Amino acid sequence: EESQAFQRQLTALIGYDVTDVSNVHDDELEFTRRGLVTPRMAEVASRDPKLYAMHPWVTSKPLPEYLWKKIANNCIFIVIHRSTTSQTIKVSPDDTPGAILQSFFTKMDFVLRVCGRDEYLVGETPIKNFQWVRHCLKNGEEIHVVLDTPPDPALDEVRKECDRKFRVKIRGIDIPVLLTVFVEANIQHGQQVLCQRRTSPKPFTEEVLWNVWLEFSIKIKDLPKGALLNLQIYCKVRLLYYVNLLLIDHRFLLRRGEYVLHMWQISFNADKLTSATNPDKENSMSISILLDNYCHPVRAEMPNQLRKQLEAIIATDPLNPLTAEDKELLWHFRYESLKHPKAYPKLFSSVKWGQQEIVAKTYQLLARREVWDQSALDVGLTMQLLDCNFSDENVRAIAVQKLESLEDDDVLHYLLQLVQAVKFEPYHDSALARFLLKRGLRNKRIGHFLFWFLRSEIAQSRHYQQRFAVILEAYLRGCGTAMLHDFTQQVQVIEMLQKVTLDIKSLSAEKYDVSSQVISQLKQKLENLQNSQLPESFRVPYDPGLKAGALAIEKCKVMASKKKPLWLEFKCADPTALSNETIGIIFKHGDDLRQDMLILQILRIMESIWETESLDLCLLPYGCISTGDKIGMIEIVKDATTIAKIQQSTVGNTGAFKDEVLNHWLKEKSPTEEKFQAAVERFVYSCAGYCVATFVLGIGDRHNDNIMITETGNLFHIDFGHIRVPFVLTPDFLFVMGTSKTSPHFQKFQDICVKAYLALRHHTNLLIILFSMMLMTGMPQLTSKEDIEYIRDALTVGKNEEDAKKYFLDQIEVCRDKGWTVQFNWFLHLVL
């Protein structure tokens, strides 16, 4: 009974039971579980036991100019410790950890490990290329390391185990409880409706029947792999219910027989694409159908003017619509289009997918992919082939092929969007799902995040938990025994804190002030938790290098906000840690943290864009992971406060705002004038960073209670769930900058803003694809073409840089012209 016990262990880890068949009409999930064995085993056998155990976090990107500034000597200072003794050593930027190790004995079995972190500076890499080294250089910190024995790879031990038209009979529809109603049947492939048929409208009663065959113009031989039968109910004509059925199964068989499909009720989006059925069989709407159908499935140069029209089509942004003329030209000139990697999304949208001979021709075109294979990886371009507009296996596989060249550093930037893009896959087993599994199995940091990202979707997505649960098991069956124990300890702690979060929430109203009553109750529930249930220690989910110990209960509190988040603090479970600082984690219910995750990740990507142009915009995209429905954890950036709180420390709970208050607060919060000048510099940069980022994302218009600042001048926006001024640049921000006109700080700010804004515009398409993907996968509501179009207008598409500069400076002027108006209107709306 060891085998069942291990499965029982995996089930608690996943947050779902993969061995359950309650909501299946086929064996695709069992087939995927078997399908994923070999990809996992091939990777486990390939991984370096030593490098896997120490997981160096490295990049092959050049040191940015802004970071070379701190090395104007060509020397890097590393503090090598051993108990009370610690010696500073002079190192070259090109020096490898082994070279630093040898020269250490020259001055005075072992490996260098960061103080208070499961972070190792090891392998054939210049130290300047380790992330922690670059983290320290950016935040002027000393590079403190420890001399210790490497971890034992034995801990990572892996446990050994037909020419006729298509038709569908719509029998009827049934709901036990809930007007006119009708059914719409769609043959879909890439959100594209190849064929549509409707039934007659009828009164909406608990059981509505038709028994009418809906014959489609398309032949059974012409149905492409990944084609969906989309069944929708309409009740003003509003969509009310949907469900999908993959017409061709995982084994390439045409779907046959009677189907009783439990439908999703509407509350456009990735949830609308799911082939999963609503698991609630007692209350949901049902659709009964019958599938009868039987089957088993030297060029001429372009003229000067046509080539001009073709290139113009390829130059347009990703959300530019294709005319039938555009599609015809892209298709007729297939072979010329092939020489332009940027044409691939537009060219693949020109393929007549519901024609077997065209598909065959598309596959013919792909067989000779020298130009694609040789192209410089373009993540923006590659992500476009992994969205909702492409169901083709072969087209999606060529995009995955390009992601194979991404280094760990880059996989981490895109991991979240790549886990989400799995929602766009017609089948559970895919090249993308196999790529995600492989990379997670290859690297401990990717794997850690892959665990939490899948777990987040498994906990709350009825539409995708089944598929996502199968991928997580596949990752859990090869990560190793140490990681399996690691995850079990994080899961136990989060499970235990989620319950405490909910019970406290169930003791306090919306904004009804936090009293000693609920505070006593928190410290009581935490005491019972710690004494028995709380394990030894655990890795911090949004910071796997950090290890949290015992709860500092005396420091734990209930925050005064509508939602009642827990403020928790833990001792670092690592003796070698230089600081005597606790780990602060917020546990919250009430906000959809999935949206925040997506926003926070786009910010880290925006930081990476600015880095490739030697810019540091001082963003603070704090750790955040969604653990369930409206619940999750937030990294406490200690010694920070809300902009509204600074205003209320002087004038109280009034919209009556003052300008000098933030500047007063910063000077008052500074230990020396040197540090105060540094803080104004940090403010100018971080303000600019957030003004460009939030403007680009259409999340600029915000209430100051959702804008925070550190005692070190670092501004940072918070609470991104469920979201006039283009951005926040109020009189108090301007006063810190020396204006109330112009200023050397205000002019520096305008310059930083312009530089950052044009740096983002050089990655317009990448930003368009990440944004649309986010709107499609993160928002529970259905998305329109309008919502997606915002970012195109904000990125001043088809505009010169001088015009773009002119544009961003006008946005800065609107914030000056509006002053405190919008902030005051937010206070009247939200505070009252």
Ligand X SMILES: NS(=O)(=O)c1ccc(Nc2nccc(-c3cccc(C(=O)N4CCCCC4)c3)n2)cc1
Contacts with ligand X, residue ranges (CB under 6 A)? 559, 561, 565, 586, 588, 622, 634-637, 640-642, 645, 718-719
Query: Residue 636, annotated ligand binder?
Result: no
CB closer to ligand X out of 192 and 641 = 641
d(C-alpha 822, C-alpha 829), whole Å:
10
Query: Residue 620, annotated ligand binder?
Result: yes
Token output for 167:
């038709």
Query: Residue 590, annotated ligand binder?
Result: yes
d(C-alpha 278, C-alpha 261), whole Å:
8
CB of 635 to ligand X, least distance (A): 6
Query: Residue 796, annotated ligand binder?
Result: no
Query: Residue 89, annotated ligand binder?
Result: no
* Residue among 357, 33, 363, 396 nearest 189 (CA): 396
CB of 768 to ligand X, least distance (A): 27
CB of 562 to ligand X, least distance (A): 9
Query: Residue 585, annotated ligand binder?
Result: yes
CB closer to ligand X out of 318 and 632 = 632
Query: Residue 716, annotated ligand binder?
Result: yes
CB of 718 to ligand X, least distance (A): 4
**CA distances to 47, 64, 409, 605, 615 from 609, in Å:** 31, 11, 14, 6, 9
CB closer to ligand X out of 120 and 683 = 683
d(C-alpha 14, C-alpha 25), whole Å:
22
Query: Residue 70, annotated ligand binder?
Result: no
CB closer to ligand X out of 375 and 561 = 561
Query: Residue 719, annotated ligand binder?
Result: yes
- 3-class DSSP state for residue 592? coil
- 3-class DSSP state for residue 345? helix
CB of 624 to ligand X, least distance (A): 8
CB closer to ligand X out of 44 and 636 = 636
Q: Do 250 and 427 meet the contact criterion of CB atoms below 8 Å apart? A: yes
Token output for 136:
């320290």
CB closer to ligand X out of 539 and 588 = 588
CB of 620 to ligand X, least distance (A): 8
Query: Residue 627, annotated ligand binder?
Result: yes
CB closer to ligand X out of 295 and 514 = 514
Q: One-letter amino acid identity for 746?
A: F
CB closer to ligand X out of 6 and 567 = 567
Cα end-to-end span (Å), the chain: 60
Q: Do 402 and 790 meet the contact criterion of CB atoms below 8 Å apart? A: no
CB closer to ligand X out of 224 and 565 = 565
Query: Residue 798, annotated ligand binder?
Result: no
Q: Do 282 and 309 meet the contact criterion of CB atoms below 8 Å apart? A: no
CB of 15 to ligand X, least distance (A): 24
Q: What is the DSSP string of 467-536?
A: HHHHHHHHHHTTS-HHHHHHHHHHHHHHHHHHHHHHHHHTTS-SS----HHHHHHHHHHHHHIIIIIS-S
d(C-alpha 68, C-alpha 62), whole Å:
10
43: left (phi over 0), alpha (psi -120 to 50) or beta: alpha
Q: How far is CA 769 from the centre of its chain?
A: 13
Query: Residue 382, annotated ligand binder?
Result: no
Q: One-letter amino acid identity for 179?
A: L
The residues facing 795 across adjacent strands are none
- Kindly give, in sequence order, each residue whose CB lies less than 8 Å from that of residue 540, ignoring residues fewer than 6 positions away: 546, 547, 548, 583, 585, 623
CB of 547 to ligand X, least distance (A): 20
List residues forming the annotated binding site for ATP.
584-593, 619-627, 716-723
List residues forming the annotated binding site.
584-593, 619-627, 716-723
